[PDB]
Paper text:
The eukaryotic chaperonin TRiC/CCT assists the folding of about 10% of cytosolic proteins through an ATP-driven conformational cycle, and the essential cytoskeleton protein tubulin is the obligate substrate of TRiC. TRiC is the most complex chaperone system identified to date. It has a double-ring structure, and each ring consists of eight paralogous subunits (denoted as CCT1–CCT8) arranged in a specific order. Each TRiC subunit consists of three domains: the substrate-recognition apical domain (A domain) and the ATP-binding equatorial domain (E domain) linked by the intermediate domain (I domain). Here, we present an ensemble of cryo-EM structures of endogenous human TRiC throughout its ATPase cycle, with three of them revealing endogenously engaged tubulin in different folding stages.
Author numbering:
A (entry chain G): 15 to 526
B (entry chain Q): 24 to 529
C (entry chain Z): 13 to 526
The structure:
């Protein structure tokens, strides 16, 4: 029915601790697999933390809030979603300061938000600048995700795909250096060929096939036209329907259908175009007057894909087909081509410049190989985006966690007041990331973590990390286990933003 | 939820052996079986037992599927498979309790099976002399009709003898399909006889007693009111309009029987009922009309002369008619029957008519006649005869134990148990005759030790002794004993090879 | 509940449970299993692929191992139930060290170290013998004797050896689609043999037909000579039953003009004596058209298949024809003995002694229904084993000689990743010895008696030792002719390391909701 008091403060803790205990052992290169039982008897053995919680239904309101905050975090950056839910479950796991000390959560939130300012200040002190102009330094960053994959045979060519895609989308003139892979870098899959055939072209590709040979095959000066209106029968302002059942109604409708389309098609062929692009659909009779002028028919394109075509050639978006003019020209484009690739037709409006848009063309021997590269390249594109957003790396593999937790201990000696006791609990809760790395390797956890803290005290805090392969401690300056800064900045920010949301809930009530 | 997991595959076949062990022999007991259409039936044939008893265990279904292969290439000894191979799996359980592996019994059974196929030609005493006489044929058939219908073999051994001699000049064509059985209700088995050609129990409904026409057409539709293949809206209002349809029905049927007279066909077979006015039109144009309500009686005629059954109401089709030499009527046993005789042809069709007062009794004679034809259907091959009554079952068990004793190694255990499975068949014959089975086996081995061969069981309730099978006229088929030993050993090695059964979804 | 290591203890019991079931059907001395469909279908097999794919298990963990053997037959075609017996002992021997406090990731790191050393050991024991008739008999004998009750073990070897040897020439790759498998009833199980030509399901049904044609010209046809529709602009109109008799003669006249055209093409091209003519028309043939062709000596066949027509193109050489109006002699072929094989019920046309058919039909005969499906799954496993022997010229000794030799090579081997990977090569050496262990139980001998004798046999030379199925003595696999494939043993060690990893790499099981 309803629940209030201190029970929902402990009820939201065990709801987030249960989600964190599921995917706690799935961290690092030695991530353990998880077995999901379906009602139909199916079993998937995926060890990906985003794939486990997606196929698991939850009923708690706090546990439902735990999944969606990492799902939105997966859409922002393509790496670090498992470390968010682990850190959000460890910060709430020390319930001795929440219930036994009878402390209000406002003291904890004032201690948690004050510890959030020490997260950004410590990571900028252990950071290191990146020479992004050298292509050898960019290869040592993306290689952490290309290992144990089928794309690893072509790592020298697959790295050129993601690096050339992020640089074309990023605009240095705007200052803020925006990269959006979903719009300006729309990836499409083409069957046939091999992995070496996949390259990057500077344009937009249309997956509509060719149904008639009366089209433009090779045009050096493509005259493009964009239109928003439909090419069909004229409908009124009412919501009436079109039903053709009588022979008297079949003649009167088709005579009005032919006379309006021929009046529409006369306005576009007077400019002598090469390819027509309409927003809505194109009827079968509309192609009959269009094939006499040998124009390539392209239909069913979204409004978001329409502006990428207008920025590729420089055309004008015209609302109505009766209002065409001479300014709707595509002068400056490279070549128009309808050449088949593996018995599929594709339209090319590519150019020899950077018209603020691009696409990725994938090829492969089978359709399962097409799905393998697109899930590896999109994971690789978001990691290399964070490097070009800010050229700064952090020592990963638990080295940044012990460097941050060492700075919080010396800061807590000068932090007076009641809030110093939950302030020291965040330093021990940030140690769970190198704790599960030793437990997944199989060595003694407390024997290695105690010597890990002794190396972070006397020696330099930027070195002496954990290697998740052999099970011992190595120096992070020797191996390429470097993490991006913007990934680790949003990881500690979201883990605090989750802990500020679940601890502030003090009542769960119903109502529609 | 698991006790032995190898014993339950054998116990399901031991229940299949018990339903025919007490039903073995001329002194075997009958079985009150219930048909699936809720009909009471009394029989003792081993093939009719498995047809009605829907056995469900798939481990015992291998011996039933071996019985369907036992019915092929030989028509003798279906009860021999369910007794001997049942004794194989029962005696194999005494070896597995000691510690012997199941793969050791398998190779030991196939060794003694090939050894038993060499001793069986040594026991062939007599053979058929190919004289085509009724004295030579009925002397060997008296043993096969025994264990089916005991006491009435003196009338059955002479009737099937007169049928198979008429086919034996047709060399290489003798089969069980040439001798058909048609049951007629009557007094008893003493009034039964044998006729040539195709004989049906129903007489000619027409008034023609003899016709020499060759064209025979069969129509499965009854003689009734004609319905057009189109819609045909026929409406009547007054009594004069009803008489125009009544007289018009007889006038159209007058042209329907005239189309049979136009093609030169004077023999018509009707599956359904015949109207009285249509029966008058058949006798006007001298057409023989025979009513056959049975579908198996109609399907028999299509496979002999080629006359097919057409669903239309008398269509004049010259292509789908049959050909016969002489169709006439004969009065045999106070009942007129129709004979499809072959006068111009040499003839290879014979029909044994059986008489009786009970349909449950006459069906057991039909299984005894078809097993009598199948005894000589085997003897179209190489003629070799073996002594019956358990005479060959002791001598084969005497030589295999003598062979398995001299052979050293671990394989001597499965060879010794292959001989004792042959001892259950005289144990089945002694138990069903009310005699102590332990005394007859000792009396059989004492006379076979001195070399007195061809000694089997004396069929008598008061006499527990034995007698000679050569002087008694008891003789079995060597090919009937050849395929029975081979198929039962191949069936009993299949059950021992399968260890566990797992159900699977399609 | 139970958020602990209990998710591993339930998965190894499904592995131990699937090991104890499938251990009774390895080798020729093993037993068989029955597959009941619930409706009455009975099937007996020893193949572990059909024992896991067709057989349904209730346990969810054991359903994953059923998906392992489906991936085994796609690359090799052998060793599916031997895949289960290794991974059953691999997770059994892992439990001796996990209960002592060792992490399963450490044993996984030792299993990949034992996989690279055992794969390097397979390159030294392989024998690059020249592929001839005699060495392919021993390869076919190790594969076909495990699906046969030892009465067809001698007859079925020469049927599969001579079939693949007739299609292995000019260094061409072996294609299994060139081999046609046909089944016929009313015969014994030992009556199977090889057929040079093809087997058609329906033959000529006419009393005036020739029973055997020694030489003939085969015309490929695909035209329906039955009652067809109009090819000219007309319609089906009739006023009564007499108008239908005029219409059926005006419609069938489009058929018999083509039938007499085949006789005009027969008399033109080789119309003299010592000739022949067979029609291989796939579609239906008019029964009135069968009387018109059989009077001049033409055997007409009807009711064929689509795949059989393509094999008739390679056998005779005639191009597939679609219309009789443009009949031409380049669509004609040639064959040798064209006769009919008579059964108890049906008849089958046999077209052997072809010029260059490039297709061999295997004729498998059986008395029962389940007997036909057992040999059909045996000939597909036997032909794929010899195909692995021709394409991969190196072979390995059989009778478990590789697994005992790999147990000694893995003992004298130190790990180079850590010290705790010493149990990874220890448990991999003990789990590979389950194949001489399970071959003692199926043969009826003691398990530990022949294991000592197979391990004490060592010498200062190259010598392989295996188990004996008859006496239980040490037996050299090269001296008796027991050989396996190098490709099967390479995929055996590769697939066993992957599947035993994934069962060892789970810690929690959750109920999904799609
Ligand atoms: N050999 C190694 N030893 C120890 N740590 C390693 C090793 N290799 C990589 N790592 C670290 O492990 C981290 C990956 O941890 P984890 O699997 O929990 O996150 P993730 O699943 O990669 O995150 P996301 O879900 O965002 O991709 C990497 O950031 C890397 O720094
Ligand atoms: N009166 C008898 N004298 C001697 N032996 C007999 C006698 N009756 C039966 N037998 C023995 O019984 C065995 C065959 O008996 P039986 O007639 O019961 O088989 P069957 O009923 O013909 O088989 P099926 O069920 O196939 O018809 C033979 O071995 C035969 O020696
Ligand atoms: N005559 C023989 N004597 C001893 N061992 C043999 C003999 N023939 C085969 N083997 C052994 O049996 C093993 C194969 O067993 P089996 O044929 O029962 O399974 P399989 O059919 O190979 O399994 P899968 O169908 O999974 O490939 C081989 O490794 C071989 O060493």
């Amino acid at each position: 029915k309803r629940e209030s008091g201190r029970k929902v403060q402990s009820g939201n803790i065990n709801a987030a601790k249960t989600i964190a205990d599921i995917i706690r052992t799935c961290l690092g290169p030695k991530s353990m697999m998880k077995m999901l039982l379906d009602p139909m008897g199916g079993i998937v053995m995926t060890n990906d933390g985003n794939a486990i919680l997606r196929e698991i239904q939850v009923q708690h309101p706090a546990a439902k809030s735990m999944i969606e905050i990492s799902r939105t975090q997966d859409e922002e950056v393509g790496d670090g979603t498992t470390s968010v839910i682990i850190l959000a479950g460890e910060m709430l796991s020390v319930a001795e300061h929440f219930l036994e000390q009878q402390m209000h959560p406002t003291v904890v939130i004032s201690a948690y938000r004050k510890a959030l300012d020490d997260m950004i200040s410590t990571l900028k002190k252990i950071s290191i600048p990146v020479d992004i102009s050298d292509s050898d330094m960019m290869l040592n960053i993306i290689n952490s995700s290309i290992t144990t994959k089928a794309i690893s045979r072509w790592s020298s060519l697959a790295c050129n795909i993601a690096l050339d895609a992020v640089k074309m989308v990023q605009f240095e003139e705007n200052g803020r250096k925006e990269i959006d892979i979903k719009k300006y870098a729309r990836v499409e899959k083409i069957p046939g060929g091999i992995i070496e055939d996949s390259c990057v072209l500077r344009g937009v590709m249309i997956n509509k096939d060719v149904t008639h040979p009366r089209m433009r095959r090779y045009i050096k000066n493509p005259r493009i036209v964009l239109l928003d209106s439909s090419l069909e029968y004229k409908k009124g302002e009412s919501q009436t329907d079109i039903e053709i059942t009588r022979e008297e109604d079949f003649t009167r409708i088709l005579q009005m259908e032919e006379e309006y389309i021929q009046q529409l098609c006369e306005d576009i062929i007077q400019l002598k175009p090469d390819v027509v692009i309409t927003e809505k659909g194109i009827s079968d009779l509309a192609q009959h007057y269009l094939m006499r002028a040998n124009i390539t028919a392209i239909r069913r394109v979204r409004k978001t894909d329409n502006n990428r075509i207008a920025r590729a050639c420089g055309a004008r978006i015209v609302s109505r087909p009766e209002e065409l003019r001479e300014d709707d020209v595509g002068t400056g484009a490279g070549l128009l081509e309808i050449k088949k690739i593996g018995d599929e037709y594709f339209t090319f409006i590519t150019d020899c410049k950077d018209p603020k848009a691009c696409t990725i063309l994938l090829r492969g021997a089978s359709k399962e190989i097409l799905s393998e590269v697109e899930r590896n390249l999109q994971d690789a594109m978001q990691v290399c985006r964070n490097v070009l957003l800010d050229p700064q790396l952090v020592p990963g593999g638990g080295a940044s966690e012990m460097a941050v937790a060492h700075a919080l201990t010396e800061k807590s000696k000068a932090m007076t007041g009641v809030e110093q006791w939950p302030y020291r609990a965040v330093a021990q809760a940030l140690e769970v990331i190198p704790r599960t790395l030793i437990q997944n390797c199989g060595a003694s956890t407390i024997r290695l973590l105690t010597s890990l803290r002794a190396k972070h005290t006397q020696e330099n805090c930027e070195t002496w990390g954990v290697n998740g392969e052999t099970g011992t401690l190595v120096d992070m300056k020797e191996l390429g286990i470097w993490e991006p800064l913007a990934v680790k900045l949003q990881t500690y920010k979201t883990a605090v933003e989750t802990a500020v949301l679940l601890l502030r809930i003090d009542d769960i009530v119903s109502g529609h | 939820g698991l006790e032995e997991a190898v014993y339950r595959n054998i116990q399901a076949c031991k229940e299949l052996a018990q339903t025919t062990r007490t039903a073995y022999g001329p002194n075997g007991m009958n079985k009150m079986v219930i048909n699936h259409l809720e009909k009471l039936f009394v029989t003792n044939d081993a093939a009719t037992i498995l047809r009605e008893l829907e056995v469900q265990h798939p481990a015992a279904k291998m011996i039933v599927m071996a019985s369907h292969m036992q019915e092929q290439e030989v028509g003798d000894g279906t009860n021999f498979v369910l007794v001997f191979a049942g004794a194989l799996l029962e005696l194999a359980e005494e070896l597995l309790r000691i510690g012997l592996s199941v793969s050791e019994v398998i190779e030991g059974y196939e060794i003694a099976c090939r050894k038993a196929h060499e001793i069986l030609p040594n026991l062939v005493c007599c053979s058929a002399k190919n004289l085509r006489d009724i004295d030579e044929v009925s002397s060997l058939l008296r043993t096969s009709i025994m264990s089916k219908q005991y006491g009435n073999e003196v009338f059955l051994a002479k009737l099937i003898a007169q049928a198979c001699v008429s086919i034996f000049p047709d060399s290489g064509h003798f089969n069980v399909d040439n001798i058909r059985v048609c049951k007629i209700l009557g007094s008893g088995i003493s009034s039964s006889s044998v006729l040539h050609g195709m004989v049906f129990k129903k007489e000619t409904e027409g008034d023609v007693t003899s016709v020499k026409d060759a064209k025979i057409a069969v129509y499965s539709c009854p003689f009734d009111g004609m319905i057009t293949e189109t819609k045909g809206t026929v409406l009547i209002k007054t009594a004069e309009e009803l008489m125009n349809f009544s007289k018009g029905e007889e006038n159209l049927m007058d042209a329907q029987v005239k189309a049979i007279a136009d093609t030169g066909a004077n023999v018509v077979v009707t599956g359904g009922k015949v109207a009285d006015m249509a029966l008058h039109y058949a006798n006007k144009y001298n057409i023989m009309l025979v009513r056959l309500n049975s579908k198996w009686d109609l399907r028999r005629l299509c496979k002999t002369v080629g006359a097919t059954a057409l669903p239309r109401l008398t269509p004049p089709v010259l292509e789908e008619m049959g050909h016969c030499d002489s169709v006439y009527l004969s009065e045999v046993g106070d009942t007129q029957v129709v004979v499809f005789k072959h006068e111009k042809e040499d003839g290879a069709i014979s029909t044994i008519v059986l008489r009786g007062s009970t349909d449950n009794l006459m069906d057991d004679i039909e299984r005894a006649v078809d097993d009598g034809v199948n005894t000589f259907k085997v003897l179209t091959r190489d003629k070799r005869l073996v002594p019956g009554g358990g005479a060959t079952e002791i001598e084969l068990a005497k030589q295999i134990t003598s062979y398995g004793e001299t052979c050293p190694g671990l394989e001597q255990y499965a060879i010794k148990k292959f001989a004792e499975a042959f001892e259950a068949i005289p144990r089945a014959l002694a138990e069903n005759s009310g005699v102590k089975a332990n005394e007859v086996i000792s009396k059989l081995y004492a006379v076979h030790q001195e070399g007195n061969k061809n000694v089997g069981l004396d069929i008598e309730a008061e006499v527990p002794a034995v007698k000679d099978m050569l002087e008694a006229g008891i003789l079995d088929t060597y090919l009937g004993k050849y395929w029975a030993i081979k198929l039962a050993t191949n069936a009993a090695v299949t059950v021992l090879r399968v260890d566990q059964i797992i159900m699977a979804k399609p | 509940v139970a958020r602990a290591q209990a998710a591993l203890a339930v998965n190894i019991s499904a592995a131990r449970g699937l090991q104890d079931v499938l251990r009774t059907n390895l080798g020729p001395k093993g037993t068989m299993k029955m597959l009941v469909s619930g409706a009455g279908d009975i099937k007996l097999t020893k193949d572990g692929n059909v024992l896991l794919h067709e057989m349904q298990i209730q346990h969810p963990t054991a359903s994953l191992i059923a998906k392992v053997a489906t991936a085994q037959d796609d690359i090799t075609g052998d060793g599916t139930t031997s895949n289960v017996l290794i991974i059953g002992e691999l997770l059994k021997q892992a439990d001796l060290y996990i209960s002592e406090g060792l992490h399963p990731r450490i044993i996984t790191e030792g299993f990949e170290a034992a996989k690279e050393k055992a794969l390097q050991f397979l390159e030294e024991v392989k024998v690059s013998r020249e592929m001839d008739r005699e060495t392919l008999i021993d390869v076919a004998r190790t594969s076909l004797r495990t699906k046969v009750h030892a009465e067809l073990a001698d007859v079925l070897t020469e049927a599969v050896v001579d079939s693949i040897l007739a299609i292995k020439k000019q260094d061409e790759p072996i294609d299994l689609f060139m081999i046609e498998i046909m089944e016929m009833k009313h015969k014994s199980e030992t009556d199977t043999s090889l057929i040079r030509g093809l087997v058609l399901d329906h033959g000529a049904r006419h009393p005036d037909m020739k029973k055997r044609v020694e030489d003939a010209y085969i015309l490929t046809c695909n035209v329906s000579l039955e009652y067809e529709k109009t090819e000219v602009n007309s319609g089906f109109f009739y006023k009564s039953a007499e108008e239908r008799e005029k219409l059926v003669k005006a419609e069938r006249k489009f058929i018999e003009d083509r039938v007499k055209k085949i006789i005009e093409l027969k008399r033109k091209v080789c119309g003299d004596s010592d000739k022949g003519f067979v029609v291989i028309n796939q579609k239906g043939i008019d029964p009135f058209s069968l009387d018109a062709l059989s009077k001049e000596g033409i055997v007409a066949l009807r009711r064929a298949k689509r795949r059989n027509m393509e094999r008739l193109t390679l056998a005779c050489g005639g191009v597939a024809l679609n219309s009789f109006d443009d009949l031409s002699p380049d669509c004609l072929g040639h064959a040798g003995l064209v006769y009919e094989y008579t059964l108890g019920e049906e008849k089958f046309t046999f077209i052997e002694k072809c010029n260059n058919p490039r297709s061999v039909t295997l004729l498998i005969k059986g008395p029962n229904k389940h007997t036909l499906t057992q040999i059909k799954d045996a000939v597909r496993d036997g032909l794929r084993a010899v195909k692995n022997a021709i394409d991969d010229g190196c072979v390995v000794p059989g009778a478990g000689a590789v697994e005992v030799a790999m147990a000694e090579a893995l003992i004298k081997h130190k790990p180079s990743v850590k010290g705790r990977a010493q149990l990874g090569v220890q448990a991999f050496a003990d789990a590979l010895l389950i194949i001489p262990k399970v071959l003692a139980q199926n043969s009826g001998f003691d398990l530990q008696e022949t294991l000592v004798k197979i391990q004490a046999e060592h010498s200062e030379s190259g010598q392989l030792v295996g188990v004996d199925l008859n006496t239980g003595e040490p037996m050299v696999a090269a001296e008796v002719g027991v050989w396996d494939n190098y490709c099967v043993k390479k995929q055996l060690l590769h697939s066993c390391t992957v599947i035993a990893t994934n069962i060892l790499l789970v810690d929690e099981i959750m109920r999904a909701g799609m």
